[PDB]
Design a protein around this ligand. Sequence first.
Ligand SMILES: O=C(c1ccc(Nc2nccc(-c3cc4ccccc4s3)n2)cc1)N1CCC(N2CCCC2)CC1
Ligand SMILES: O=C(c1ccc(Nc2nccc(-c3cc4ccccc4s3)n2)cc1)N1CCC(N2CCCC2)CC1
Lengths: 242, 244
Amino acid sequence: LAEGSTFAGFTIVRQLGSGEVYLARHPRLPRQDALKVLRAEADAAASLWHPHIVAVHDRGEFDGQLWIDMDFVDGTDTVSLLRDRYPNGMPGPEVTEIITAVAEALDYAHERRLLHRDVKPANILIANPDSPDRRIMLADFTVGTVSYAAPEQLMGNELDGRADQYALAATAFHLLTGSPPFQHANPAVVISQHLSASPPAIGDRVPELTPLDPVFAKALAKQPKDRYQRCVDFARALGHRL
Amino acid sequence: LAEGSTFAGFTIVRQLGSGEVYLARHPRLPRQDALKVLRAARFNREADAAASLWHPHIVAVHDRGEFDGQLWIDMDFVDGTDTVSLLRDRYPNGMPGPEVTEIITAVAEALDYAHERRLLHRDVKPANILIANPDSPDRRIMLADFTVSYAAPEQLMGNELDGRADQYALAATAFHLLTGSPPFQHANPAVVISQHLSASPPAIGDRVPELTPLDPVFAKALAKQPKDRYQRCVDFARALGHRL
Ligand SMILES: O=C(c1ccc(Nc2nccc(-c3cc4ccccc4s3)n2)cc1)N1CCC(N2CCCC2)CC1
Ligand SMILES: O=C(c1ccc(Nc2nccc(-c3cc4ccccc4s3)n2)cc1)N1CCC(N2CCCC2)CC1
């Protein structure tokens, strides 16, 4: 609900997402930033300094609305790259590149006792995808995207890094095929499959990818104890077969 | 200046370097930033190039402003060491070859990236080369701040600059990192300046015999005429690597 508008000195350029997120020209510096705005306290994002995690510049309050100024990743999210190219799935080597980059960001955040809690294709941005300056970034540190949420997180149990691993594996499944491991119009059904349904064989969707079956079986395990120890271990197990 | 003082909401913690640069607690976010402050040209200080640059080896600028007539730049604080402190306290006679190729390659990339976008650093030196978590897997080489020891002759003369000026500085920096001292060392800055302008670039082999093979590399990168240097900073970084 703002275009060509001025907000805390920022000039609104485009809507980027929804907590509504605008592409905005900075009041003092000649560059474009991502401005997240509230209508009616994630300091952790400022705590993180990683080449694959979107940086926060500043936070504030303008006319009762809380705002976060952060880096703008000038490219696409993996959702759009999936729908406009690769509707049936991304090439294996490009997925290992993206998942490794995000695995590192998450492992870094985990070592500092911070969980992302919402890893999904829409939070994986790639600046200049077809350029040498190509850069993979992780952003955004009731029925939301239950498509990638780990069962223990849905149940509201005590979390660790292996919750984000599940989400990353669910994300990777989506990127390689053209759909998440559990697809249904009814969120309640998706939630129930996360909790109770055996994780599906990726080979049953894309025959060429059968070798990865035990990899997704492991990373999408119901019990966190049965997954990989770190996200890069999962990313490496992908690489080994792609 | 005063440690524990408030400047534009930032709490000053210590001076990091010198444009004096302080480690400062951010007014609103719970983290430490590098705050660069000016005393008394304003247009020049508004080289808004640094905000234009977004590279994994270039220190990020968050914001710029004016507090009681003093211009300030809020930028990332690289929690680790500069290469100066690494030389003084760990490797007084020079750093290991492989570690220097790592650092110079990382900085060469940052500079080559900035050059392709028509932007020059203009002050490459050991104190602007930071390494966060040096001894950790999270190790990260950063070039910050986008003394005549490293300045190229054309830059000292105030002539038209190109990327090859920063190359000279990077090569002079690499010489220092490898040997313990810059290519031209003298208490009198005027003498250092004169050697930059007129003196044949020294043989790195004449300081550290093991490094004789790099002689033509530094001869080339420290050339008087920019046209006689490498085309890109990574070409210089690669020529180092080949012989280390
Ligand atoms: O591919 C992208 C895209 C490009 C760059 C960024 N960058 C960028 N940088 C930094 C941070 C963020 C974000 C952070 C954040 C947090 C919560 C929700 C969304 C977001 S987006 N994004 C984000 C997307 N788009 C096409 C589809 C999209 N949609 C929604 C409107 C019409 C269709 C609009 C934009
Ligand atoms: O090893 C360091 C060091 C650590 C972190 C940073 N970080 C950091 N981050 C972000 C930006 C910057 C800089 C910006 C900038 C701009 C101009 C000149 C130098 C710099 S350094 N630095 C810079 C140094 N120090 C050792 C002692 C040194 N003493 C002795 C001699 C003088 C004072 C200063 C501190």
